[PDB]
């Protein structure tokens, strides 16, 4: 143990230990992993009934038996020696009391260095097992749901109910929580302001589409080619699906269609909605480096790459696909699914970005930044697709497609999206 | 491949390019094939293709519709109505592999409004086990006689149940 | 002449699994990758019904190639051994078939440092060699759970590394400076527990062909 | 009643928690659940207020924002105004959110835009802050993907709004808060 | 009038117009036919107008004219143009009085030399003591000295002969072509097609 920290849950550091060689080393990389990033080997343990943070610092992964036994015993001589000062509400408990707990710690470290050489969670069981039932039948992955509700036997352990409670409402209360706070991804997003930012090199706007097979890539993308013309965008599609038949004639229907609804006439004499296409056969990577090279020149604030529907195992093909991604470095990556998908919403979008970060060649590569989910009019509630996508990829649900026209895409509202699968 | 004389008829007059889709896959595998770009109703493309590959003795005549799903009863009264109008001998429910719950209320409205007697289970080559295909047996009361393996048209292979099975299960 | 064998490694494994812990995946792509420079470079050890010993001789380190062929041997069981880790945990007979890829792999990083001591090869990989041995000397000698021979090969691996940035100009001591930084965070666990006890090119001088000042000439 | 602190992570909400109630400077982590304490106002009368500095974290910010902006008599937006310069898409679009649930309240709280971190020589001004600010929810008001910010026919301001919004200059490390604990006199 | 000459000169140089100051500077060399200043702003008119033999023929003929009052950057500059970067290394080097310009040309004549150890240590001075318009662009030539360190037709005359063009196909996919010519057996179903 070269490090130990010990704060509140308010972001308040308690005790903290860094030996007495030089001192106080890693103490915020401590938290990050640790508290920031769950909700060297840098791990924690919580303590949710004082809202307390165990955060360790060590090596040689096999200690880890020891290591946890001694966060186990100065656990519970703080949260003993402690108790009046960490059991209070006020923030001026801890802000008032004294934590000399260095003398303890070297005892418990010197010991431990010897031995080398309220809600329970039988209570809150058989609801956290109604809970993961109801969110795995309302579409949420089967392990997506068993994650979620542990996640609140950790929160809620220790901890005292309310004046009413019970059992079961508790354990149902916090992992509606638990998964507000995880589709309610790390991200954000903007319109015309956004495109100003992408002007401020003189260049378009360009946006990868890509999933696998059937979800919405082609249709959507042409929802989002009118709700860009609608805030007085041009768009230039750029088709770069040649895997299949008619992929470059539905792109021309909807460049048809679109041109139509917003020709050079009603928007001040020049083309906003036009279709790049090489035919089938090409390759993706180069009908899209050439329509990005082409809405330069021809005046497009967007180009939307549409590419061919793929599965998730195939080496020799999301290799160029990942490939294509990394080095066209397009704006925003959008990844598709559908809200039918089960399971398969968490393989899809683990091996779509792990694909992304392999065949990627940088320092940091170029991820997923969002999912449109299509078919959102189909589910009807079992709505557990959204949950399962924002869970893995700590990215936000761009748009949710809901039919099949232009005017069905809608923004997320994730607050009654959690309100439908945490209310059983 | 087998010896019959097959023909396709594309009757989805919604999708873009969808006629477009099914004439490269007809004219790559060297079989026959109708559909119109000027004709919106499929009722009209599929009586007037069937009377047609009839009247040129065809022995497998398939028909291609579009997509639809039950909340729309205005394309679940179409296909009910494309299905009288050339009377199937067989109609066939097929079905991705990756589909969740959501399976057996949509196979169940496609059993009511119209007669399935058989199901295909496609995208079964990557990741999918296809475990949604219990709730479309059970639904439309139909055997898996096909599965399909890939985006070729070679990729498709008759259903057996024993190695189906033991994948599902592991 | 060059290799950096850091810079190797390091995207190697984040672009074949261990960006994600896989080192089952990265070892199988090591032995594919050994393959298929064995049957371009027609480098086969053995025929069909005999083997005969590869040995990497000297002639043949002009390619600047052939040390990539040691180099993933080096790797292949170094990659077993740390996957032989995690499944240690839980059937601790495994960590004896661990010990023994990694001897295995200083032996060939022992014997990939002599191939770079050749005059043919510049200083760069003679010396990137050298403490690449002396890195899998203190990760073994820390896996033989001695905290002292531990930080002996560390440290040494370390005062190594740093011979090598401060020899070169200061962009590329980036790579040795890396790799010093890289073996750091070993170093202060093993002492606390001894004392326990064509580019684009602009011709930017164009711009400074202008008139002399006219000021004296009016 | 309450005085909630809000802003984006290390913005300096939990330094100026402690600077207000202790006076002195406290080492502070990432903060992931609210912290409550009281806060007895430099006026004659001594008015205590109930602060509460709720987490900056985008998982945390809206989920703890609702639970506590019914109860809220005055809410302080922290900004880093040393990072503001990189910041101002993520200052602006927190802000919008802080402003739409401010004028759907029934008793619509008192507002300050405590532009924190002044101590340090690359912070921006609370006048340029303003300026940049207004700049940017004039854009956010149409880029936003009903309770609108003023006029849609005028440029943005704060002004227009049915707010009591300040902006003051701060410094969390003693401490420059004489014109926090000013305006926490004033509105007690 | 001389000094309307050089407010004519003066006038034009500023304007980028030196293909008048290229005509009022031949007017000063035909009155003042040893004026350094004008033998300077012929050389720079012909420089900036592509002349690179033309403005060295000027630092040629008037060599002990331009003497230690010198154009060691233009003539290291005309001959670093017209394919010499022997004669423009040799040049920089026998200057009398180093300058910001011709240490630009010397960073540009030692990455022409594939001397990329000093045109390193000449590009790192040259981006901290440059404050000009063209620092991206010293940024881009620094860049590239760090990635350096590591209508023949067979006969014109028998192409409107057979056939006024080849085959209207003429070149595309082999197995595209009318000839074909692939010895293709049968097709089978490997890639994409159904074109
Ligand atoms: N009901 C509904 N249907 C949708 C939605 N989004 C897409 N679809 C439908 O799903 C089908 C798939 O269309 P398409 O855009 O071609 O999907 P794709 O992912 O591009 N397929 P490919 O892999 O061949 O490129 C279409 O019939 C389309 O209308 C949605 O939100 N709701
Ligand atoms: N120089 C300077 N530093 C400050 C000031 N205010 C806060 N800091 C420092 O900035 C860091 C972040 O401050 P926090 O108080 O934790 O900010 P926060 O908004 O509560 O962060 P979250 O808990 O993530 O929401 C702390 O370590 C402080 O030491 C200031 O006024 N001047
Ligand atoms: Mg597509
Ligand atoms: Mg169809
Ligand atoms: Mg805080």
Redesign the pocket.
């Given at each position: 143990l070269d490090f130990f920290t010990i704060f509140s849950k308010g972001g308040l550091v308690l005790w903290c230990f860094q030996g007495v060689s030089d001192s106080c080393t890693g103490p915020v990389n401590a938290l990050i992993r640790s508290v920031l990033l769950q909700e060297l080997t840098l791990k924690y343990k919580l303590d949710n009934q004082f809202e307390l943070v165990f955060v360790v610092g060590f090596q040689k992964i096999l200690t880890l038996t020891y290591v946890d036994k001694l966060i186990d015993d100065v656990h519970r001589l703080f949260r003993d020696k402690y108790r009046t000062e960490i059991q209070q509400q006020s923030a001026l408990s801890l802000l008032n009391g004294t934590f000399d707990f260095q003398n303890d710690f070297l005892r418990l470290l010197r010991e431990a260095e010897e031995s080398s050489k309220s809600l329970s969670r039988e209570d809150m069981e058989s609801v956290l097992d109604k809970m993961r039932d109801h969110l795995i039948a309302k579409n949420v992955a089967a392990d997506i749901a068993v994650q979620l509700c542990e996640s609140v036997a950790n929160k809620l352990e220790g901890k005292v109910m309310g004046t009413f409670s019970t059992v079961t409402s508790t354990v149902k209360q916090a992992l509606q929580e638990s998964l507000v706070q995880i589709l309610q991804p790390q991200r954000r997003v903007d319109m015309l302001r956004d495109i100003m930012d992408a002007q401020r090199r003189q260049r378009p706007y360009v946006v990868t589409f890509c999933?696998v097979?059937?979800?919405?890539?082609?249709?959507?993308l042409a929802k989002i080619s009118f709700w860009l013309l609608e805030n007085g965008f041009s768009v230039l599609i750029a088709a770069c699906?040649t895997f299949?038949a008619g992929?470059v004639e539905?792109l021309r229907t909807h460049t048809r269609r679109l041109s139509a609804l917003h020709p050079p006439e009603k928007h001040g004499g020049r083309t906003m909605v036009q279709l790049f296409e090489k035919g089938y056969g090409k390759d993706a990577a180069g009908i899209a480096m050439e329509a990005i090279a082409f809405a330069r020149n021809q005046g497009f604030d967007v180009v939307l790459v549409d590419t061919?529907?793929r599965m998730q195992d195939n080496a020799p093909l999301m290799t160029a696909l990942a490939k294509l991604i990394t080095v066209n470095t397009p704006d925003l990556v959008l990844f598709?699914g559908e809200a039918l998908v089960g399971n398969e919403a968490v393989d899809q979008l683990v091996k779509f970005n792990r694909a992304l970060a392999d065949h990627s060649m940088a320092q940091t590569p170029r991820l997923i930044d969002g999912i449109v989910l299509?078919?959102?009019?189909?589910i009807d509630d079992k709505v557990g697709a959204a949950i399962s996508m924002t869970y893995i990829t700590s990215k936000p649900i761009v748009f949710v497609?809901?039919?099949?026209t232009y005017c069905?895409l809608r923004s997320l509202n994730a607050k009654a999206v959690v309100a439908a699968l945490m209310k059983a | 491949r087998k010896g019959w004389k097959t023909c396709l008829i594309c009757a989805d007059t919604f999708?873009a390019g969808a006629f477009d889709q099914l004439k490269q896959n007809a004219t790559k595998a060297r079989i026959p094939f109708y559909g119109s770009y000027t004709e919106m109703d499929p009722v009209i493309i599929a009586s007037e293709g069937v009377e047609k590959f009839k009247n040129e003795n065809f022995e497998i005549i398939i028909v291609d519709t579009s997509?639809r799903?039950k909340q729309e009863d205005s394309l679940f009264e179409e296909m009910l109505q494309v299905a009288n109008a050339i009377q199937p001998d067989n109609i066939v429910y097929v079905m991705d592999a990756s589909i969740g719950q959501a399976c057996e209320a949509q196979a169940k409205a496609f059993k009511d409004k119209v007669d399935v007697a058989s199901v295909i289970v496609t995208k079964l080559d990557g990741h999918a086990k296809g475990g949604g295909a219990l709730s479309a047996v059970a639904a439309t009361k139909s055997p898996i006689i096909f599965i399909g393996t890939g985006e070729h048209i070679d990729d498709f292979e008759p259903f057996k149940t024993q190695p189906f099975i033991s994948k599902l299960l592991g | 002449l060059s290799l950096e064998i850091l810079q190797i490694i390091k995207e190697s494994q984040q672009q074949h699994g261990l960006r994600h812990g896989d080192f089952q995946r990265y070892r199988g792509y090591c032995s594919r990758r050994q393959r298929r420079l064995r049957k371009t470079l027609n480098f086969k050890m053995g025929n069909r019904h005999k083997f005969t010993g590869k040995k990497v001789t000297e002639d043949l380190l002009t390619d600047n190639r052939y040390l990539l062929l040691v180099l993933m041997d080096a790797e292949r069981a170094w990659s077993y051994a740390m996957q032989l880790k995690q499944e240690a945990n839980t059937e601790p007979r495994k960590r004896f078939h661990l010990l023994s890829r990694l001897r295995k792999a200083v032996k060939h990083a022992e014997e990939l440092e002599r191939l770079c001591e050749s005059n043919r090869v510049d200083a760069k990989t003679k010396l990137e060699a050298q403490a690449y041995t002396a890195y899998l000397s203190g990760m073994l000698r820390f896996e033989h759970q001695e905290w002292k021979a531990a930080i002996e090969a560390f440290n040494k691996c370390k005062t190594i590394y740093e011979k090598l940035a401060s020899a070169f100009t200061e962009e590329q001591a980036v790579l040795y400076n890396q790799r010093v930084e890289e073996i750091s965070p070993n170093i202060r666990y093993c002492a606390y527990n001894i004392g326990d006890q064509k580019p684009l090119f602009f011709d930017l001088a164009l711009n400074h062909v202008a008139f002399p000042p006219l000021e004296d000439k009016l | 009643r309450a005085v909630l602190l809000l802003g984006l992570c290390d913005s300096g909400k939990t330094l100026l928690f402690v600077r207000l109630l202790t006076g002195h400077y406290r080492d502070t982590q990432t903060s992931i659940t609210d912290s409550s304490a009281t806060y007895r106002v430099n006026n004659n009368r001594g008015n205590s207020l109930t602060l509460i500095d709720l987490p900056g974290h985008e998982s945390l910010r809206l989920q703890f924002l609702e639970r506590f902006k019914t109860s809220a008599r005055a809410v302080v937006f922290v900004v880093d105004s040393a990072a503001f310069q990189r910041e101002v898409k993520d200052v602006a679009e927190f802000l919008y959110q802080v402003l739409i649930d401010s004028m759907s309240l029934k008793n619509t709280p008192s507002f300050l835009i405590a532009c924190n971190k002044q101590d340090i020589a690359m912070a921006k001004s609370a006048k340029l802050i303003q300026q940049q600010l207004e700049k940017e929810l004039n854009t956010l008001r149409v880029t936003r993907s009903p309770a609108q910010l003023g006029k849609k026919g005028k440029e943005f301001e704060f002004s227009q709004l049915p707010l009591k919004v300040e902006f003051l200059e701060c410094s969390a490390k003693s401490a420059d808060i004489q014109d926090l604990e000013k305006w926490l006199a004033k509105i007690a | 009038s001389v000094p309307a000459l050089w407010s004519e000169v003066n006038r034009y140089g500023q304007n980028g117009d030196f293909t008048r100051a290229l005509k009022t500077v031949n007017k000063i060399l035909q009155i003042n036919k040893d004026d350094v200043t004008a033998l300077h702003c012929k050389v720079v008119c012909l420089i900036q107008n592509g002349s690179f033999k033309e403005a060295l023929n000027v630092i040629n003929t008037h060599t002990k004219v331009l003497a230690n009052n010198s154009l060691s950057f233009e003539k290291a500059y005309c001959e670093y143009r017209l394919n010499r970067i022997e004669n423009a290394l040799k040049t920089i080097e026998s200057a009398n009085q180093q300058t910001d310009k011709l240490k630009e040309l010397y960073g540009q004549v030692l990455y022409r030399l594939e001397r990329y150890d000093e045109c390193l240590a000449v590009y790192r001075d040259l981006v901290r003591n440059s404050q000009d318009d063209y620092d991206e662009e010293r940024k881009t030539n620094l860049s590239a000295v760090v990635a350096a360190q590591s209508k023949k037709k067979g006969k014109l005359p028998k192409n409107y002969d057979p056939k006024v063009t080849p085959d209207p196909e003429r070149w595309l996919p082999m197995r595209x072509x009318x000839x074909x010519x692939x010895x293709x057996x049968x097709x089978x179903x490997x890639x994409x097609x159904x074109x």
């Open positions: 999933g097979n059937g979800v919405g890539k082609s249709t959507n699906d299949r992929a539905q061919a529907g598709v299509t078919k959102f009019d189909t497609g809901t039919g099949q069905d | 999708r997509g799903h | - | - | -």
